[PDB]
Ligand binder design. Structure first.
Ligand SMILES: *[C@@H]1O[C@H](CO)[C@@H](O[C@@H]2O[C@H](CO)[C@@H](O[C@@H]3O[C@H](CO[C@H]4O[C@H](CO)[C@@H](O)[C@H](O)[C@@H]4O)[C@@H](O)[C@H](O[C@H]4O[C@H](CO)[C@@H](O)[C@H](O)[C@@H]4O)[C@@H]3O)[C@H](O)[C@H]2NC(C)=O)[C@H](O)[C@H]1NC(C)=O
Ligand SMILES: CC(=O)Nc1nnc(S(N)(=O)=O)s1
Ligand SMILES: [Zn+2]
Length: 266
């Protein structure tokens, strides 16, 4: 039903999904000269990331992104509640165009963004249930840029895109070290209250966006940008530009878990 572009595109989401028009939405542009340092923000502590179970993980092209199911044995230990892993997925732009990430830092987008989705199992029994509640979800956002060499960790995912080119196709991915999908310096991140960046746009996410970026090769990017289709069959249409436009900060506070010399905040 909903899409990024067209009649049912993002500019029209509010006409079908009211919350998409609300005022504490995601993604946002994080301007470091406006964040507030919070010395009490804990280390994230991803648990079980190195070994996401022993069974093959499902990889699904759902027409809007490619999504990897994750076992609830993985969870984050440094949050207000116990948030267990449910899935991760990606947002990107398109070959020959700039951008592709959802969040921006100091008004600069990167080529793609990885979202690892967790939900509060202390309070709820499923991802879908938690997705509609206040701080029901905790999503980790990793901005992805292009580096000089192939990133093996991301390759564990990218090497399977050709198996799920059509919307709704699925394939299997052997467990791999998920920690390697994360950038360096896990201790430097931003934290704010936001929402799902796709319809229904529920304001249920406690967001964590890392300060440092992960890097994939130029070739891995082109592969991410032009393999999957948004269609179930012919004619085929490439799944591209699946990132939502920036949403107004609307006076929310963005907190930083770190501070350094020359930080634009004190
Ligand atoms: C995302 O949005 C949520 C919802 O708005 C925010 O949650 C609120 O966070 C504030 C923290 O600033 C909470 O208010 C403070 O509560 C302190 C007591 O905390 C305990 O008790 C509360 C209430 O039962 C619990 O929610 C909490 O978990 C603790 O168990 C008070 O000590 C604070 O008062 C002091 O500071 C104020 C300044 O605002 C002074 O005026 C007071 O005199 C005093 O010095 C304050 O009341 C609030 O309870 C939270 N609401 C909910 C529903 O959780 C998140 O902070 C926000 N996250 C981000 C990253 O933006
Ligand atoms: C059930 C569930 O997780 N739905 C989501 N919708 N958008 C998400 S995102 N892009 O904000 O991570 S997660
Ligand atoms: Zn996402």
């Amino acid at each position: 039903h909903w899409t990024y572009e067209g009649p049912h595109g993002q500019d029209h989401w509010p006409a079908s999904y009211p919350e998409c028009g609300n005022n504490a939405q995601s993604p946002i542009d994080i301007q470091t000269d406006s964040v507030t340092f919070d010395p009490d923000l804990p280390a994230l502590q991803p648990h079980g990331y190195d070994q996401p179970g022993t069974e093959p993980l499902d990889l699904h092209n759902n027409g809007h992104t490619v999504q990897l199911s994750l076992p609830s044995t993985l969870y984050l230990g440094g949050l207000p509640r116990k948030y267990v892993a449910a899935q991760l997925h990606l947002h990107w732009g398109q070959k020959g165009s700039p951008g592709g990430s959802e969040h921006q830092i100091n008004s600069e987008a990167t080529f793609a963004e990885l979202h690892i989705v967790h939900y509060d199992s202390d309070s709820y029994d499923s991802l879908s249930e938690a997705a509609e509640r206040p701080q029901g979800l905790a999503v980790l956002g990793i901005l992805i840029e292009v580096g000089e060499t192939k990133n093996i960790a991301y390759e564990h995912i990218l090497s399977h895109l050709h198996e799920v080119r059509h919307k709704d196709q699925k394939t299997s991915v052997p467990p791999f070290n998920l920690r390697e999908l994360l950038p360096k310096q896990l201790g430097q991140y931003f934290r704010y209250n936001g929402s799902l960046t796709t319809p229904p746009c529920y304001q249920s996410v406690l967001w964590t966006v890392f300060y440092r970026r992960s890097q994939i090769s130029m070739e891995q990017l082109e592969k991410l940008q032009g393999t999957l289709f948004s269609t179930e069959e012919e004619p085929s249409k490439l799944l591209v530009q699946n990132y939502r436009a920036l949403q107004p900060l609307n006076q929310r506070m963005v907190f930083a878990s770190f501070i350094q010399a020359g930080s634009s905040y004190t």
